[PDB]
């Protein structure tokens, strides 16, 4: 899996409260986090399915 899957979730500088998903390598699954709305890193998905298909098993 891509290494960006191992990065912790990044909220970013904007101040919105948008629910996104990131892969948690320690737990082996995708979890939710609050995204600020701008400058997203790659371990940031709009759905749990997208996240698992891209980072599952990282």
């Amino acid at each position: 899996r891509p290494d960006f899957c191992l990065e912790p979730p990044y909220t970013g500088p904007c101040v919105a409260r948008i629910i996104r998903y990131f892969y948690n390598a320690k737990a082996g699954l995708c979890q939710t986090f609050v995204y600020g709305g701008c400058r997203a890193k790659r371990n940031n998905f709009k759905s749990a399915e997208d996240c698992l298909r891209t980072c599952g098993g990282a």
Binding site: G12, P13, C14, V15, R17, V34, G36
Partner: protein, 238 residues
């Protein structure tokens, strides 16, 4: 516009607002009622918010709200017919961060629901002017507060803002704060208003700032004066 039926009495380190004293403040929520951004009513059929909030027609505009934890409180859940994102929004620099929302069915203005005034492209709001920002964003850098919050803060000159943010500050941005208060997650899209001849006028739209919602760093907002021509044109064509 800009004149609350209920007068206000004067976000991290902010304070609870008088119920309904900021009638243009709306909450943008998803189909489940989850608040993700703020917004401002500019008339019965249009709401102005930030481009980065990513509003879609599946989201809803909630007007006349004070306590999001109150199921009894009477509010208006307005459907969104169309979203007008400024095509100039730069997803990299965050400049021109503004979006207009056209409501499916007009809002019923009242004592707790009305519009904020828009400034003229030429208006000049001097640095040091005490303005106000409102919202249901976090009060500590964590769940959002139930009741609408407010904070009085000063506008900063571009020179003073840049002493901190440098060249990240673009032409369609305006800074305010670094005075003991700070906007935070959930406040985006909300208003930054200052009085113009006694009427509250939208000078800024909560955009971005400190990654930790620090109260000693300048908060950045979309500069409405640099974007109002786009707003007027959008209205006239729709």
């Amino acid at each position: 516009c800009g004149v609350p039926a209920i007068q206000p009495v004067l976000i991290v380190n902010g304070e609870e607002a008088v119920p309904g004293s900021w009638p243009w403040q709306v909450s943008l929520q998803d189909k489940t009622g989850f608040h993700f951004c703020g917004g401002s009513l500019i008339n019965e059929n249009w709401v102005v918010t930030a481009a980065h909030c990513g509003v879609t027609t599946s989201d809803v505009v909630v007007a006349g709200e004070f306590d999001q934890g109150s199921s009894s409180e009477k509010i208006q859940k307005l459907k969104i017919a169309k979203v007008f994102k400024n095509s100039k929004y730069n997803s990299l620099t965050i400049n021109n961060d503004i979006t207009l929302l056209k409501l499916s069915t007009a809002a019923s203005f009242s004592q707790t629901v009305s519009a904020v005034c828009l400034p003229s492209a030429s208006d000049d709001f001097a640095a040091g002017t005490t303005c106000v920002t409102t919202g249901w964003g976090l009060t500590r850098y964590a769940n959002t507060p139930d009741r609408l919050q407010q904070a009085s803060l000063p506008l900063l000159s571009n020179t003073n803002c840049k002493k901190y943010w440098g060249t990240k500050i673009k032409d369609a941005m305006i800074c305010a704060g670094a005075s003991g208060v700070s906007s935070c997650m959930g406040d985006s899209g909300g208003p930054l208003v200052c009085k113009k001849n006694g009427a509250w006028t939208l000078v800024g739209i909560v955009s971005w700032g400190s990654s930790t919602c620090s109260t000693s760093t300048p908060g950045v907002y979309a500069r409405v004066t640099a974007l109002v021509n786009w707003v007027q044109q959008t209205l006239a064509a729709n």
